[PDB]
Each structure stands twice: as structure tokens, then as C-alpha cells.
Amino acid sequence: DVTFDVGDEYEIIETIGNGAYGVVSSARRRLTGQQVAIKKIPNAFDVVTNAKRTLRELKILKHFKHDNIIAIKDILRPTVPYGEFKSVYVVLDLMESDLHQIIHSSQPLTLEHVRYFLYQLLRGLKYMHSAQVIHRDLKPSNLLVNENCELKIGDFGMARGLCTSPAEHQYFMTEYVATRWYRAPELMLSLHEYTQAIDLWSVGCIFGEMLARRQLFPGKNYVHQLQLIMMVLGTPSPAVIQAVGAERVRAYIQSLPPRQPVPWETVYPGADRQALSLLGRMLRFEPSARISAAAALRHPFLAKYHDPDDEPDCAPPFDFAFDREALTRERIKEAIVAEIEDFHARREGIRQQIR
Amino acid sequence: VLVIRIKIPNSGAVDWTVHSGPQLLFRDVLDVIGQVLPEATTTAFEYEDEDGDRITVRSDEEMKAMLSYYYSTVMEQQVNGQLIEPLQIFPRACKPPGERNIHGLKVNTRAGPSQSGRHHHHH
Ligand SMILES: Nc1ncnc2c1ncn2[C@@H]1O[C@H](COP(=O)(O)OP(=O)(O)NP(=O)(O)O)[C@@H](O)[C@H]1O
To answer: Could you tell me the domains of chain A?
Structure first.
């Protein structure tokens, strides 16, 4: 179902990118000649969860303006007619590649590339985290990159905010899905504590990935993932082992010999002193011992790029009520249509420029 | 009605004529700013007090103190029948890359979701 009719503002050039919930293509704005990405989301209201995920994606990206977070340049107005409007078209910055493609190539990635990539990632996150937004699926392929090493965070469909009042934990895990490789212990263990720290486990994995140029914990299934981690980190302390909410994985946690951590200096033998020190501060079982993105920006490893004035918070926090968990499919379409209209309706050439 | 004047470097000024209203939000400014300054991202803007001292607005809250001062400033002016000055704001110049003191990366051939990979290309 990938057919792009964007017509007459834009000219489509090939196809770059694929996934669920949409297909992306390179395009050129006709008269200006500006190069963009266009992401078609075919039949985007047909399924209540895909519907929420779409509305969730538009509202989040509209809220942000940051050089390290991917930006919506345009959202095509419904073409003629409404006619049970189906596919949504969103225009974005054209990004040439992604960190996964970079990390795994025969191309050199120096310590200096990892410093600058890690810096930019942490920058955008400080921003997103102060909006009280947790990305929740952060992996090298979701981080877009271009020839000049600009790094921009993508893929906000998995992002959720809050956590709300004591509910919903539990239902915090619905719908979602994510590779277990970047998944955080509290998401693995149902630890009933879900914060922006979730993303910082993922950063540590990405950071380690960039140093070794191979996945840090590529688990083949659930306990294997749980095991691969425990190899290097050792077993979780009794306090976390007792904080496990289900299955009981607490059982089989209660089992096994208590293991000990492996110093990052052996797991990455030839690796920078500072990088390892920061990597260590990010990967920890307890979310509360994990360094923040805001504080990580101040680590000596990043000292070269650190600019307090250039590292903004996101001014009003994002408001995640509008949570659609039941919230009938049609009213969701209305809201998605409610955006795109507002998006255009906020211009408003309301101003005059002195000659 | 309120007019905000946006000083834009080496160009001129933009005069934004607000609704009214209420209410003016910090974002409403940022959104107008980024709209008149398309090639940049602006998270912040300053404005001058009686002393001529720049005072920065990073959010709502501080927005409210700008409006408070400027409204005082407005009261006094045409009480004396003086010509009413627009509220003038100076968008804080933010760095482009910029941040990257040095280097590039290849995008021609990716392939490639490797592990030890990746087996593909082309050119
Ligand atoms: N702005 C962009 N510039 C260049 N490539 C992009 C851009 N956006 C997305 N892509 C590529 O297209 C792919 C699909 O876009 P994406 O937004 O991730 O789809 P989706 O709704 O996230 N599907 P999924 O990845 O399964 O969750 C991405 O993985 C990118 O590799």
C-alpha cells in the first residue's frame, strides 16, 4: 500500500526507509527545490492502536523544536475529498543515514565520532526528558545521521510520558513492544518504577555499541537477555531482586548463584578511561542510580562539547493526558485531523517586516 | 492590542501584532520567532528594561514578568500622550553545527543492519 500522492507542492524521489506504521521517501519541494523526507502512513485510522500511536507522534513532534530531535516541516492537508480520509503524509528533514548504518560499516568511527554522537544524543534527550517524555525505544537505527554527523532522534510512536498516579503501572506496558537488546531492567523486570532513566539504559547500550562496534547485549530470548546483562553487571542486589513484580522472574532471580560485576575496563579493554567512566554511570539495574542525561552532559568525557547555555530544557512540559487507551477510533481520527489543521492554521502571516 | 518587535540581525525588524487575546504564551513567541527566523532554532529571547539591561525569557513565568514591566511602560507613555513603543525582543542566537569542531561521515553505501556485517552496498 505504498503509493505517494503528494502532488504539486512536492516531487517524489525514490524511497528511503520502511517499517510498520509507514514508509518514508525522499522528496523535493517543487518550487524551492528544498530536499525533504515524506512519510506516508497508509490507512492510519483503521486500527485504534495505530491511530493513537499516530496522534501521539504528531503531538510530540509538534511540541519539540531541537536540532537533535527530528522535526515536522509539513503535514499534507487532506486531499480531495475527506472521503473517509485514510493515509496521512508528514514532511520531515531529509536525513541521509543512521547510526546503525554508521556503527556497522567498514568506515572509520573514531573516539571523536563517539564523543560527538553521544553528546548530540544526550542533548536532545535532556530536552525531551524535561518535557517529561520517555522515548522508550532508543536504538542506533532510530537515530538519524548525515554526512556532517548531525544526529537526530526519531521514532516517537513508542514514547509515553508520566507515569501517572499509581495507575497505570502494569498497563504502562501496553501496547508497546521493543527489542530486548536496548530494553531497560525495570521494563524487563516489571519493577514498578518507570522514569526518564528508561532511556538512559538504552544510551549506555548505544554508547557501548559505538566503542566495540557490536551490540552489547544481543539476547536471543527473554532469560538469555536477562543473563547476558547479568554476566557483565553481576546479579541484582536483594533490594531490586525483591522489587520484581512478576512471573515470578523473582523466582530464578532468587535462584542462580549471586554473581559479581565485570569492570568495564575488562569488557572494553582498549577503551578510553573517561568514556568507560560515563558508560558505567548509565548502566545500572536500579533506575535511580543511573546518571541523568542532564548530568551526563556535564561528564568530563563530553567536556569538549558541553555548553550550559546551548542545552535547553523544553519550556512547557508535554501534556500526555489525551491518553487514548480505549477512546473510540473515530474521535482519534478527529484529533489527528484536529492537528494538521491547527498546524496550517498557526500561520498566520500576522506580521510585517520593515523594509 | 500589543505589538512585539523582533530584532533580526543585519536585516531589519519584524512587527508581530498580537490578537488579543488572552493569553500570550512563551510558545506563541517562539513560534513567531522561528517563523520569521526559519533557518534557525530559537529557544529563548531577551528584552530590555528601563536601565537598558537585557532580561532573558526561557519560559512562561518569566514571560509574565516581561508583560508586567512592559505594561507599566505602556501606562506611563500615553498618560503623557507619548507615542507608544512596541515591545522589542531580541531572539537569542543559537549555534548551528557549529557544535562540530571538525568532522564528516560517509553516506553513499550503507547496507547493513550489521552484527559483524553487513553484506551489501552500491555505487
Ligand atoms: N526524516 C528521515 N530522513 C531520512 N530517513 C528517515 C527519516 N525518517 C525515517 N527515516 C527512515 O525510514 C524509516 C522509517 O521511519 P519510521 O518513522 O521509523 O517509521 P515507523 O512508524 O517508526 N516504523 P518503526 O520503525 O517499525 O517503528 C526509519 O527507520 C528511517 O530509517
So the answer is: 1-94+328-345 (3.30.200.20), 95-327 (1.10.510.10)
In chain B, residues with a C-beta closer than 8 Å to the C-beta of A145 are: 105, 107
Q: Which amino acid is at B41?
A: T
Q: How was this structure determined?
A: X-ray
Query: β-pairing, A133-134 with A160-161?
Result: antiparallel
The C-alpha atoms of residue A134 and residue B93 are separated, in whole angstroms, by 28
Q: Tell me the domains of chain B and their CATH numbers.
A: 1-123 (3.10.20.90)
Distance of alpha carbon B82 from alpha carbon B37, whole angstroms: 31
Q: Binding site annotation covers A52?
A: no
Is residue B14 within 8 Å of residue B36, measured between CB atoms? yes
B interface test, pick of A72, A101, A347 with most B CB neighbours within 10 Å: A101
CB contact at 8 A, B107 and A26: no
Whether residue A94 has its Cβ less than 6 Å from ligand 1: yes
DSSP assignment of A73-129 equals EEEPPP-S--SS---EEEEEE---EEHHHHHSSSS---HHHHHHHHHHHHHHHHHHH
Name chain A contacts of B44, Cβ cutoff 8 Å.
312
Sheet order of strands, A97-98 included: A97-98, A143-145, A151-153
Chain B residues with CB inside 8 Å of A101's CB?
107, 110-113
Active-site entry in A74, A137, A155, A199 = A137
Which of B104, B110, B116 is nearest residue A101 as measured by Cβ atoms?
Answer: B110
Cell of A249: 522472574
State the pairing for strand pair A351-353/B3-8.
unpaired
Given resolution (angstroms): 2.6
3-class SS string, chain B: CCEEEEEECCCEEEEEECCCCCCCCHHHHHHHHHHHCCCCCCCCEEEECCCCCEEEECCCCHHHHHHHHHHHHHHHHHHCCCCCCCEEEEECCCCCCCCCCCCCCCCCCCCCCCCCCCCCCCC
Q: In what order do the strands lie in the sheet with A88-93?
A: A10-13, A23-29, A35-41, A88-93, A72-75
Active-site annotation holds for A323? no
